[PDB]
Amino acid sequence: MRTRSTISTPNGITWYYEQEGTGPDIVLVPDGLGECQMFDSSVSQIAAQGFRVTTFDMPGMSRSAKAPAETYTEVTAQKLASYVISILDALDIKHATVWGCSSGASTVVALLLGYPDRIRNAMCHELPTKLLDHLSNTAVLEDEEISNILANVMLNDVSGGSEAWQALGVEVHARLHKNYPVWARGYPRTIPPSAPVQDVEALRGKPLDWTVGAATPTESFFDNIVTATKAGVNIGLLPGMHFPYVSHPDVFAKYVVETTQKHLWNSS
Amino acid sequence: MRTRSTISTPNGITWYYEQEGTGPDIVLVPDGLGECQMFDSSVSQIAAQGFRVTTFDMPGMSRSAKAPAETYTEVTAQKLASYVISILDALDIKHATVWGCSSGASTVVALLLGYPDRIRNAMCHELPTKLLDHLSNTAVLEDEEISNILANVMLNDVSGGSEAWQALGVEVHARLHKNYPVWARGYPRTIPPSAPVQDVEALRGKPLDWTVGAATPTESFFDNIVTATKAGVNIGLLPGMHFPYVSHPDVFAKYVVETTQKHLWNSSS
Ligand SMILES: C[C@H](O)CCC[C@@H](O)CCC/C=C/c1cc(O)cc(O)c1C(=O)O
Ligand SMILES: C[C@H](O)CCC[C@@H](O)CCC/C=C/c1cc(O)cc(O)c1C(=O)O
Ligand SMILES: [K+]
Ligand SMILES: [K+]
Q: Using the mean position of ligand 4's atoms as its centre, give its distance from the Cα of residue A113 in Å.
A: 43
Active site residue A177: no
**The dihedral formed by the CA atoms of B265, B267, B268 and B269, expressed in degrees to the nearest 10:** 80
Residue B160's closest chain A neighbor by CA?
Answer: A217
B232: left (phi over 0), alpha (psi -120 to 50) or beta: left
8 A C-beta contact, residue B231 and residue B200: yes
At position B179, the amino acid (one-letter code) is N
Dist CA A120 CA A118 (whole Å):
7
8 A C-beta contact, residue A138 and residue A162: no
Residue with the smallest CA separation from ligand 1 atom 2 is: A220
3-state secondary structure of B58: coil
At position A156, the amino acid (one-letter code) is N
Long-range contacts of B217-220 (CB under 8 A, 24+ apart): B217/A214, B217/A215, B217/A216, B217/A217, B217/A218, B218/A212, B218/A213, B218/A214, B218/A215, B218/A216, B218/A217, B218/A218, B218/A220, B218/A221, B218/A225, B218/A237, B219/A214, B219/A215, B219/A237, B220/A218, B220/B126
Dist CA A226 CA A224 (whole Å):
5
Query: Which residues, other chains included, contact A239 with Cβ-Cβ below 8 Å and sequence gap of 6+?
Result: A160, A213, A214, A215, A247, A248, A251
Dist CA A107 CA B154 (whole Å):
40
- Determine the distance in angstroms separating the CA of A214 from the nearest CA of chain B, rounded to an integer: 5
Which of A213, A218, A229 is the closest to B214 by Cβ? A218
Using only C-alpha atoms, chain A has a radius of gyration, in whole angstroms, of 17
Work out the end-to-end distance of chain B between its first and last CA atoms, rounded to an integer number of angstroms: 33
- DSSP states of chain A: --EEEEEE-TTS-EEEEEEE-SSSEEEEE--TT--GGGGHHHHHHHHTTT-EEEEEPPTTSGGG--S-GGGSSS--HHHHHHHHHHHHHHTT--SEEEEEETHHHHHHHHHHHH-TTTEEEEEEES---S--HHHHGGGGS-HHHHHHHHHHHIIIIISS-HHHHHTT-HHHHHHHHHHHHHHHHHSTTTTGGG-S-S-HHHHTTSSEEEEEETTSBHHHHHHHHHHHHHHT-EEEEESSSS-HHHHSHHHHHHHHHHHHHHHHHHH-
| CB burial string A231-248: b at 16+ within 10 A, e below | bebebebbbbbbbbbbbb
**Resolution limit, Å:** 1.6
**The dihedral formed by the CA atoms of B129, B134, B135 and B139, expressed in degrees to the nearest 10:** 130
Which ligand is closest in space to the CA of residue A224? 1
Chain A residues with CB under 8 Å of B203 CB are none
For A188, phi then psi, to 5°, come to -65, -25
8 A C-beta contact, residue A213 and residue A134: no
Dist CA A119 CA A98 (whole Å):
7
CA A126 to centroid of chain Cα atoms: 10
Chain A residues with CB under 8 Å of B221 CB are 218
Residue with the smallest CA separation from ligand 2 atom 17 is: B188
Experimental method: X-ray
Query: Which residues, other chains included, contact B240 with Cβ-Cβ below 8 Å and sequence gap of 6+?
Result: B159, B160, B161, B213, B214, B215, B246, B247, B248
Tell me, yes or no, if A212 comes closer than 8 A to chain B by beta carbon.
Answer: yes
Catalytic residue among A42, A86, A102, A159: A102
8 A C-beta contact, residue A37 and residue A63: no
Dist CA A156 CA A171 (whole Å):
19
8 A C-beta contact, residue A121 and residue A130: no
Q: Shortest CA distance to A151 belongs to which of A115, A117, A175?
A: A175
Asked if residue A132 has its Cβ within 6 Å of ligand 1, the reply is yes
Q: Do A217 and B222 touch (CB under 8 A)?
A: no
List the catalytic residues of B.
102, 126, 242
Domain that holds residue A91: 1-268
Dist CA B108 CA B114 (whole Å):
10
3-state secondary structure of B20: strand
Dist CA B67 CA B13 (whole Å):
4
Dist CA B202 CA A8 (whole Å):
58
Sheet holding A234-238, edge to edge: A3-8, A14-20, A52-56, A25-29, A96-101, A119-125, A208-213, A234-238
Q: Shortest CA distance to B57 belongs to which of B164, B166, B175?
A: B175
- DSSP states of A78-126: HHHHHHHHHHHHHTT--SEEEEEETHHHHHHHHHHHH-TTTEEEEEEES
Residue with the smallest CA separation from ligand 1 atom 24 is: A102
At position A170, the amino acid (one-letter code) is V
Query: Would you say the C-alpha torsion A104, A109, A110, A115 has a positive or negative sign?
Result: positive
Q: How many independent structural domains does chain B possess?
A: 1
Using only C-alpha atoms, chain B has a radius of gyration, in whole angstroms, of 17
Q: What is the best residue among B220, B225, B241 to mutate for testing ligand 2's pocket, by most ligand atoms within 8 Å of CB?
A: B220
Q: Using the mean position of ligand 4's atoms as its centre, give its distance from the Cα of residue B2 in Å.
A: 21
8 A C-beta contact, residue B151 and residue B175: no
Q: Using the mean position of ligand 2's atoms as its centre, give its distance from the Cα of residue B128 in Å.
A: 6
**How large is the angle between the packed helices B218-231 and A218-231, nearest 10 degrees?**
40
At position A249, the amino acid (one-letter code) is P
8 A C-beta contact, residue A110 and residue A196: yes
Dist CA B211 CA B235 (whole Å):
6
